[PDB]
């Protein structure tokens, strides 16, 4: 437990997330992470954290989830965190506000956030601009460890969510090293609702095709998210129709619209996804589930509730071969990455594991 660590915790951040309500507090978080003001990572990556996984090298396994730069302003700034790889997103084809304001809350209580944005996006165009201007930085980034994920979403007016999707596949798709389909945003009318188990075959059909027809070096893997709130038999038809077709990978899991027992926050009842630590065990579950039905042969990038070694390590042995976090850094600050890194590394040599791949699925083989 480093100094920054304890004071970021414990002084910093309660103190600033005092002064600023969340939305413009996490509008300062990007700005400043853009301009580079952050502290020192110290922590360097070894050799057990490194997972090779989707096509590429990861040189560790703790990614920043999407939702937190959506627009990609700040990416260089969030390796810098120490981030092993980082996805912006969700991005929509045009650009549009998002849903009126209050539309964030905090449940400090919990370890906590409602969201309810509703995916505001500088729309593809600005965005590809944005990813253009550092392109071939990021090729270099890439090729030493630290891939590039986007997230694609659609807008609230579309009337064929798979144009949206295809337009955003042909446009940052070329930009990507990994795409990602949502079939869970809970803020969108009708976007979940993308498992009539022939719909959602139409639509990632449609998307790998757009896929398939990028050239070589600009063609990304796919993966579809999903919400932690699937029926037994949505999981069994999305399990189904990601063998039939090739998708990629999987990213478990979204927020919930289910607000689980015990709940302490005077804002629980607002509307809209719930993260952070009321999510982590039921995303631990969907992983472990999802893992299972696919026999472990369709990489996982488990995501809900993360803030230590511990918490991570559950995630890989329950499937997972990577995993992200958000809520944590908005309560840790920049500090918990390395947190989570260390803890990691001790807790594979504590259970005698060669490294993060070994520890992979493990619970499925007990
Ligand atoms: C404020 C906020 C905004 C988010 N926006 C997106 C988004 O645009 N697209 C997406 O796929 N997930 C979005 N997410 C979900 C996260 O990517 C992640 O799946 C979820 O928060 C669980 O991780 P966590 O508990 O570590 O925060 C958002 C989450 C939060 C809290
Ligand atoms: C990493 C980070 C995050 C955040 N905060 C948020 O992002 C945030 C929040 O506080 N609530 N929230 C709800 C939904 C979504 C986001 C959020 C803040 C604010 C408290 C200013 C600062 C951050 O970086 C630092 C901290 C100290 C020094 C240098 C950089
Ligand atoms: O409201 C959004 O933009 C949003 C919130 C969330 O939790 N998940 C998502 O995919 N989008």
Redesign the pocket.
């Known amino acids: 437990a480093t100094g920054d660590e304890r004071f970021y915790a414990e002084h910093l951040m309660p103190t600033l997330q005092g002064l600023l309500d969340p939305e413009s507090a996490?509008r300062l978080a990007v700005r400043f992470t853009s301009l580079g003001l952050l502290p020192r990572a110290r922590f360097q990556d070894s050799d057990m954290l490194e997972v090779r996984v989707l096509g590429h090298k990861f040189r560790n396994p703790v990614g920043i989830?999407?939702?937190?730069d959506?627009h990609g302003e700040a990416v260089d700034g969030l390796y810098k965190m120490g981030f092993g790889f980082v996805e912006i997103?969700?991005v929509t084809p045009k650009p549009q506000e998002g849903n009126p304001r209050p539309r964030?809350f905090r449940l400090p209580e919990d370890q906590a956030?409602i969201?309810r944005?509703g995916?505001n996006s500088h729309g593809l165009s600005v965005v590809e601009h944005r990813l253009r201007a550092r392109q071939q930085k990021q090729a270099k980034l890439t090729e030493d460890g630290l891939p590039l994920g986007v997230?694609l979403?659609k807008n609230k007016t579309s009337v064929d969510a798979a144009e949206d999707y295809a337009e955003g596949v042909r446009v940052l798709g070329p930009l990507a090293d990994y795409l990602?389909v949502?079939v869970?945003?809970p803020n969108t009318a009708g976007l979940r609702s993308l498992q009539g188990k022939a719909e959602l075959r139409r639509l990632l059909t449609k998307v790998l095709q757009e896929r398939d027809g990028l050239r070589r070096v600009h063609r990304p893997a796919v993966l579809v998210?999903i919400a932690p709130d699937l029926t037994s038999q949505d999981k069994e038809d999305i399990a189904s129709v990601v063998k039939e077709l090739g998708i990629d990978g999987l990213?478990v899991?979204?927020?919930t619209v289910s607000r689980p027992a015990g709940l302490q926050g005077a804002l629980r009842s607002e509307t809209g996804?719930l993260?952070?630590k009321p999510?982590?065990d039921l995303?631990t579950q969907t992983i472990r589930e999802m893992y299972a039905l696919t026999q472990g042969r369709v990489p996982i990038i488990g995501?809900?509730?993360?803030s230590s070694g511990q918490d991570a390590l559950e995630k890989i042995r329950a499937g997972a071969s990577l995993v992200?976090?958000?809520?944590?850094l908005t309560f840790w600050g920049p500090p918990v990455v390395g947190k989570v890194k260390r803890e990691l590394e001790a807790l594979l040599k504590e259970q005698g594991f060669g490294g993060v791949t070994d520890a992979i699925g493990a619970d499925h083989r007990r």
């Open positions: 996490h989830a999407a939702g937190f959506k997103g969700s964030v956030v969201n944005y995916f997230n979403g990602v949502n869970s945003s998210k990213i899991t979204n927020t996804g993260s952070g999510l982590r995303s995501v809900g509730g993360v992200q976090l958000y809520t944590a």
